[PDB]
């Protein structure tokens, strides 16, 4: 429940490496991993692009001394308050990173540490996340629109559903923050679920309560319930990703304000126009009945009535998934990147 | 409703100055206003500390070209969506800045512009805001605690209540974002309501709907209602400021997450311990029955049952307000600042 020190957590990890930073002719290295540049400066962690041998890697750096300040207010149990730190959250994440091994999930290849700074080694998914965000979602560039083709969307969903199978059924983990920025693609058309920073071990398939990214949170969270089926939470969020992949915009969600976001999620019907509709004005092809059908199975506001991952994978809509559409898509995308 | 261009809005302002920036021996000037340093770099606007003659000023810089990109999603009316910009929001703010004149409100002394960059001139409230925030609220320093004394709190509240009288009764404006960071104090013990960036003109005392800072928003906002009495919204928020002034922490609110914030506000009883309770642990005197009584009149979850500003000003609790407590407090505070 409340885990021990980092050392304890990692004591049974069989690829824990001693931290060794150094310079060799003004290129900075982490343990043979040559630091190229940083890919993403988060508020806390941060991912680093590196090279070792001839392969490419993304190392995620956390630091104890940094996240152990930044304390918040959890629940209570005892009503005698509760005091948690972002380092406490990371311990739980660490244990998970240590447990995940699957072709459909980003899995680390080693942990480098001094028990303060921590570098988790990951393969580098050269096509980054399936969509990118700033004021809205885009594929490659904020300037030309372009929506992901359906046949490719099919592949991605089937892929992430497969990773649900692993975490939910094999590992008993609820991902708890399934969003576009967390589905990574490589050049060859592999798609992987990543960032388990919000992930928790379920108790009888139930998850703790209310945590993740607001606009991806299910109606359940706005009830009296207090417990929710982990799987259905991740299903809902994939549904949103699906909606986002269709429209390049998040459904009822959107900025300013969040009361208006939350009075919405629990009760309100999602609008299903044609690809560009919420998007014709920022820039100053389109779907078909079946596409909206499938997607609506994910966004049943009542969770016991929401689609299973099993039913999903075996639904008619995915029965014509051709992995070659994704491989071709991913290949051309990679060719369009590093051209910028 | 939908106002015109900046020129139009300002056409009947009688102290609109032509922008004139220049250097005189590597001190940068705005129109005789010598730029000292910047006080607060917001996400958009920004406030500048300046000097002219021997007086001190805080100029708030906005820019058209900057906030006209940054568009969001308002309501609809027509269900044919609605597209607003942060520059649109500022037009409404501009009209208001142009209307407010009161000893209890920060009122501009001139607007300097080229119809893109805009500098609103304000007196400089040398004691800044009544409390400061980072991970929690503090008076001067994050290291020594110290709570504002009750007799001083009395003065501040009476002061802000007075400014409600002006905006609500004389001007028909709802402030809509009453919070500690917006109540400014000078060295001499004057306290002024400021930042009308969220402020709106009421229609039959009602305000539009759901806008401001989440943790200061009233229960009404979580109903079916759609319209709320402007005054009672500002009353609620002053109540929170009061709660914050008592405990140096925001009530049920607090970070992570907001569903947990909103399932709270609408239904849930506020806890009233003694000054340091939520605060004994960050740092690793105290109130009295009457104080909590008064404050509870502000935080009636039902707005038609919440305290008036009239009743407040004439309540027993303020009947012994001694302005000299604030003047002495403000004097010593100023002496403790610029000592850092
Ligand atoms: N193995 C990888 N290959 C390529 N890009 C990556 C990889 N890992 C992370 N990234 C990029 O870095 C971003 C953020 O990484 P993440 O592990 O989600 O950190 P975070 O602090 O949780 N950020 P966010 O999830 O956006 O709040 C991802 O969205 C990717 O764009
Ligand atoms: N006249 C003034 N004298 C002294 N300090 C000031 C003055 N005006 C603004 N400030 C400081 O600048 C801060 C932010 O100014 P404000 O006009 O609220 O901009 P903002 O972008 O709305 N920031 P926030 O309200 O915190 O989201 C205030 O909280 C004060 O600390
Ligand atoms: Mn992430
Ligand atoms: Mn403000």
TrEMBL record, chains A, B:
Reactions catalysed according to its record: L-tyrosyl-[protein] + ATP = O-phospho-L-tyrosyl-[protein] + ADP + H(+); L-seryl-[protein] + ATP = O-phospho-L-seryl-[protein] + ADP + H(+); L-threonyl-[protein] + ATP = O-phospho-L-threonyl-[protein] + ADP + H(+)
Enzyme class: transferase
Family: Belongs to the protein kinase superfamily. STE Ser/Thr protein kinase family. MAP kinase kinase subfamily.
Cellular component GO terms, alphabetical: cytoplasm; nucleus
One MF annotation (Gene Ontology) recorded for this entry: protein kinase activity
Domain Protein kinase stretches: 33-318
PROSITE patterns given in the database record: PROTEIN_KINASE_DOM, PROTEIN_KINASE_ST
Keywords linked to the UniProt accession: ATP-binding, Kinase, Nucleotide-binding, Transferase
Protein name in the entry: mitogen-activated protein kinase kinase
Keyword flag Nucleotide-binding: yes
Domain of life of the native organism: Eukaryota
One Gene Ontology term from the biological process aspect of the record: mitotic DNA damage checkpoint signaling
Keyword match Isomerase: no
EC number: 2.7.12.2
InterPro entries tied to this protein: Kinase-like_dom_sf, Prot_kinase_dom, Ser/Thr_kinase_AS
One Pfam family this sequence matches: Pkinase
